Design an enzyme around this catalytic site. Structure first.
Site, PDB file in Angstrom:
ATOM      1  N   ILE A   1     -46.162  18.175  29.673  1.00  0.00           N
ATOM      2  CA  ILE A   1     -47.141  17.677  28.704  1.00  0.00           C
ATOM      3  C   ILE A   1     -47.333  16.174  28.904  1.00  0.00           C
ATOM      4  CG2 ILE A   1     -47.787  17.511  26.230  1.00  0.00           C
ATOM      5  CD1 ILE A   1     -45.695  19.914  25.800  1.00  0.00           C
TER       6      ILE A   1
ATOM      7  N   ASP B   1     -47.297   1.164  14.104  1.00  0.00           N
ATOM      8  CA  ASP B   1     -48.125   1.447  15.272  1.00  0.00           C
ATOM      9  C   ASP B   1     -48.729   2.856  15.181  1.00  0.00           C
ATOM     10  OD1 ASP B   1     -49.099   0.429  17.936  1.00  0.00           O
ATOM     11  OD2 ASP B   1     -47.626   1.759  18.858  1.00  0.00           O
TER      12      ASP B   1
HETATM   13  C1  7RO Z   1     -53.474  15.824  26.441  1.00  0.00           C
HETATM   14  N1  7RO Z   1     -52.280  16.647  26.188  1.00  0.00           N
HETATM   15  C2  7RO Z   1     -51.108  16.268  26.996  1.00  0.00           C
HETATM   16  C3  7RO Z   1     -52.399  17.905  25.523  1.00  0.00           C
HETATM   17  O1  7RO Z   1     -53.443  18.532  25.497  1.00  0.00           O
HETATM   18  C4  7RO Z   1     -51.229  18.427  24.809  1.00  0.00           C
HETATM   19  C5  7RO Z   1     -50.733  17.674  23.746  1.00  0.00           C
HETATM   20  C6  7RO Z   1     -49.657  18.124  23.008  1.00  0.00           C
HETATM   21  C7  7RO Z   1     -49.038  19.360  23.321  1.00  0.00           C
HETATM   22  N2  7RO Z   1     -47.942  19.863  22.600  1.00  0.00           N
HETATM   23  C8  7RO Z   1     -46.739  19.249  22.222  1.00  0.00           C
HETATM   24  C9  7RO Z   1     -46.462  17.885  22.585  1.00  0.00           C
HETATM   25  C10 7RO Z   1     -45.275  17.333  22.048  1.00  0.00           C
HETATM   26  C11 7RO Z   1     -44.399  18.132  21.235  1.00  0.00           C
HETATM   27  C12 7RO Z   1     -44.766  19.457  20.960  1.00  0.00           C
HETATM   28  N3  7RO Z   1     -45.894  20.019  21.427  1.00  0.00           N
HETATM   29  C13 7RO Z   1     -43.304  17.322  20.830  1.00  0.00           C
HETATM   30  C14 7RO Z   1     -43.486  16.054  21.323  1.00  0.00           C
HETATM   31  C15 7RO Z   1     -42.624  14.941  21.022  1.00  0.00           C
HETATM   32  C16 7RO Z   1     -42.007  13.950  21.878  1.00  0.00           C
HETATM   33  N4  7RO Z   1     -41.225  13.102  21.144  1.00  0.00           N
HETATM   34  N5  7RO Z   1     -41.330  13.553  19.852  1.00  0.00           N
HETATM   35  C17 7RO Z   1     -40.574  12.982  18.753  1.00  0.00           C
HETATM   36  C18 7RO Z   1     -42.168  14.646  19.737  1.00  0.00           C
HETATM   37  N6  7RO Z   1     -44.712  16.017  22.094  1.00  0.00           N
HETATM   38  C19 7RO Z   1     -45.313  14.896  22.757  1.00  0.00           C
HETATM   39  O2  7RO Z   1     -44.695  13.865  22.911  1.00  0.00           O
HETATM   40  O3  7RO Z   1     -46.651  15.089  23.195  1.00  0.00           O
HETATM   41  C20 7RO Z   1     -47.491  14.077  23.918  1.00  0.00           C
HETATM   42  C21 7RO Z   1     -46.912  13.937  25.310  1.00  0.00           C
HETATM   43  C22 7RO Z   1     -48.877  14.673  23.977  1.00  0.00           C
HETATM   44  C23 7RO Z   1     -47.527  12.746  23.193  1.00  0.00           C
HETATM   45  C24 7RO Z   1     -49.563  20.118  24.421  1.00  0.00           C
HETATM   46 CL1  7RO Z   1     -48.819  21.624  24.903  1.00  0.00          CL
HETATM   47  C25 7RO Z   1     -50.662  19.660  25.172  1.00  0.00           C
END
Ligand code: 7RO
Length: 248
Positions: A16, A131
């Protein structure tokens, strides 16, 4: 390829995100989807280490207080790495808003209550994010969930943070996020020169425009949020009782 967090095996499907840490979309032995964040600790100072332990601690405690904070199911911490097992969300609010041209006045209001619930929970435990941007919120089954607490863009920066910071600093930021979901632009998106942008945010003469919208209650929330004097700015408990949040 694969990873083990506290006895349980997980299979990677996609990465991700990614400095020292990397986020993955994984699968457990029962083919259930999660998001594992792996942190490499090999080149990390005590200050960095404590900040990481502090966000996991807060993430852990706040689970029990609001379903608007990302689920942390399990975790594995050694001197070399951190593995955090969390629920997997569909897309972050920022990417979602980049893709989605328009916004449903009902989906926006629903996401708004969610942001207030999440940010209110962190305030109740003495945290001020500072932030706050849409990249900090995640869509999990038609629900916005706060991803981080600021413990581990400048369009969302409060005026008081530049003049030198309280729960009202997060109000300015949320206000900018809603202004984006209402007007398709943040209040100071029009200024490219980042130095000039910082001046516009702190200059009271730079009267922020609020075009006439069918939702009169929404226009009011944006005006109340985006008051340069934090003392004059609306609080989260007040925002929670606003007709925009509470009335059909
Ligand atoms: C543009 N992006 C990358 C997407 O479309 C995208 C964005 C988010 C997605 N899911 C997702 C991202 C997630 C998490 C759980 N699910 C948990 C986290 C997380 C990391 N640290 N903490 C405290 C929580 N997380 C996360 O950090 O996501 C980003 C990389 C998109 C910022 C998925 Cl599967 C795809």
């Amino acid at each position: 390829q694969s990873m083990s967090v506290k006895g349980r095996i997980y299979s990677i499907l996609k990465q991700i995100g990614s400095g020292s840490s990397k986020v993955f979309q994984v699968l457990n032995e029962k083919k259930q989807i999660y998001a594992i964040k792996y942190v490499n600790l090999e080149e990390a100072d005590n200050q960095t280490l404590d900040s990481y332990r502090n966000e996991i601690a807060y993430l852990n405690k706040l689970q029990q207080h609001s379903d608007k904070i990302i689920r942390l199911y399990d975790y594995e911490i050694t001197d070399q790495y951190i593995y955090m097992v969390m629920e997997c969300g569909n897309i972050d609010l920022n990417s979602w808003l980049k893709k989605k041209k328009s916004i449903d006045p009902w989906e926006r209001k629903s996401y708004w209550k969610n942001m207030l619930e999440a940010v209110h929970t962190i305030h109740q435990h003495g945290i001020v994010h500072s932030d706050l941007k849409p990249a900090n919120f995640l869509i999990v089954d038609g629900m916005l969930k706060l991803i981080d607490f600021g413990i581990a863009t400048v369009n969302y920066m409060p005026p008081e943070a530049i003049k030198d910071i309280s729960p009202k600093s997060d109000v300015w930021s949320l206000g900018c996020i809603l202004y984006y979901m209402t007007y398709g632009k943040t209040p100071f998106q029009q200024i490219i020169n980042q130095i000039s942008k910082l001046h516009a945010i702190i200059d009271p003469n730079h009267e922020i425009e609020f075009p006439d919208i069918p939702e009169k209650d929404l226009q009011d929330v944006l005006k109340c949020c985006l008051k340069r004097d934090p003392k004059q700015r609306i609080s989260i408990p007040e925002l929670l009782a606003h007709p925009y949040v509470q009335i059909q």
